[PDB]
Amino acid sequence: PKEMLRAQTNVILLNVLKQGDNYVYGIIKQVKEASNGEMELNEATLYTIFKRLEKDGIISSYWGDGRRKYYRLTEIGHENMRLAFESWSRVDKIIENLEA
Amino acid sequence: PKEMLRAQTNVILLNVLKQGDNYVYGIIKQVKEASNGEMELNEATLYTIFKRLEKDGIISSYWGDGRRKYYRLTEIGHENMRLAFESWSRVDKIIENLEA
Ligand SMILES: c1cnc2c(c1)ccc1cccnc12
Ligand SMILES: [Cu+2]
Predict the structure, then answer these.
(1) SS3 per residue for A61-93
(2) CB count, 10 Å around CB of A94?
(3) A11 is in an annotated binding site
């Protein structure tokens, strides 16, 4: 379901940036490693997602002295990531009680 | 973020139905209990979500002999729930490796 793989890739990328500013190929490398090789993200996919995140002010970009484009989680981005993690944490516990 | 509370309420409702066919007020009661009272879903919200799920063939409805409308997870619904749980389970582990 396209809308769901989009949400998953979004959460992964934001967690990569949570650990530190990074550039596209460094991100793709980290995600391939952490996924045991089963997630090879495409460059153009990152650009598509990063354009929406930059527009929404969740991330921003800057140049790093050949010159790579780096991305950073903004202050809003960090705060939104925290709200998401906490709200979905509640969802996780709700599902736990339903099953018991 | 409206799109995110929609996804959360969807996952909760599908997990309620995973445990057994149910009707709107029985669902609202279970979700209020499992959430320690902090999630009181509105009737009309369930109807909005169930209309989209029925249309997509994820759930179906039937009458239960005063007569309540019951909802059931379909066969497609169960299988989609399993794929989601497994894919998001991978996402969970990917994020775990990034943090280590
Ligand atoms: C099922 C399970 N987890 C999720 C979703 C659906 C959708 C979004 C999301 C965002 C962050 C963390 N988990 C989820
Ligand atoms: Cu999740």
Answers:
(1) EEEECCCEEEEEECHHHHHHHHHHHHHHHHHHH
(2) 24
(3) yes
Residue type, B85: F
Cα–chain center distance at A84: 12
Question: Which H or E run includes B63?
Answer: strand B59-64
Q: Environment class of residue B63 by beta-carbon count within 10 Å: exposed (0-12), middle (13-18) or buried (19+)?
A: exposed
Distance in angstroms (rounded) separating the CA atoms of residues A46 and B47: 36
Whether chain B has a CB inside 8 Å of the CB on A44: the answer is no
Q: Closest Cα to residue A75, out of A88, A100, A58?
A: A58
3-state secondary structure of A3: helix
Q: A94 lies in which domain range?
A: 1-100
Q: How many domains in chain B?
A: 1
Mutate to test the interface with B, among A91, A92, A97 (most CBs of B within 10 A): A91
Experimental method: X-ray
Contacts of B19 in chain A (CB under 8 A): 98-99
> Could you say which DSSP state residue A21 is in?
-
- Residue A94 to residue B31, Cβ atoms within 8 A: yes
Residue located nearest, by CA, to atom 13 of ligand 1: A88
Q: How many CB atoms lie within 10 A of CB B55?
A: 9
Identity of residue B16: V
**CATH number of the domain to which B100 belongs:** 1.10.10.10
Nearest to B8 among A8, A87, A97 (CB): A87
